[PDB]
Design a binder for this molecule. Sequence first.
Ligand SMILES: Nc1ncnc2c1ncn2[C@@H]1O[C@H](CO)[C@@H](NC(=O)[C@@H](N)CO)[C@H]1O
Length: 224
Amino acid sequence: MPVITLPDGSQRHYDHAVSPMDVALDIGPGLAKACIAGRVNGELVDACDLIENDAQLSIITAKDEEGLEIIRHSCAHLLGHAIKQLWPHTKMAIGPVIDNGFYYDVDLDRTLTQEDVEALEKRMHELAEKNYDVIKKKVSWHEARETFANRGESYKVSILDENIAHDDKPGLYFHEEYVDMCRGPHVPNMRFCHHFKLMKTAGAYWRGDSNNKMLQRIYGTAWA
Ligand SMILES: Nc1ncnc2c1ncn2[C@@H]1O[C@H](CO)[C@@H](NC(=O)[C@@H](N)CO)[C@H]1O
């Protein structure tokens, strides 16, 4: 029975757990449509995350700096979704947000040509324009590892084996048949990710160690 207080001081009493999206829809259709994520007691959370206890809630939209960062991060997931369709054997490493954009380091046997990059961007636009929902599932360290092992995603498994505590609960984000892992938040639907472009590619050693494989870094930019 969390008591939710909004920035304006208005309060809402609930006798069941509610998500930022649930509260946004209670306020109005416009706010629900604009909702990308929420901030609960100072912490950024996905719009679908349940609030069980009393809390201060704010709704994050594309007009917020946090909203732009989330859109950029979700565009990295979109790149993965598309590249796994074009070259299924590709292995995804790390895809973070950077100042004015994002990048994703990938392991695939073909050295990407400019035509390949253009094909990748084209597929990304096609997929994003389907306006599919991003489905989030909070899971155990072990379920996350099984999920990526079953996909042959060795770098994701390595991140779990060496960089994530066994008691941590990773967030899995499903984009149709594609799945990625992140602390998030991520957009609730890809309709928020139509404005982006791929830029250049570069090379980067996995974990910055020259004893490891040289990956391909694909750079992109995205905006509201
Ligand atoms: N404790 C944790 N729980 C959930 N996700 C975690 C995590 N520690 C690291 N990550 C994710 O692993 C990738 C490399 O840091 C990062 N994510 C990614 O590279 C893809 N989502 C592409 O954006 C990062 O979010």
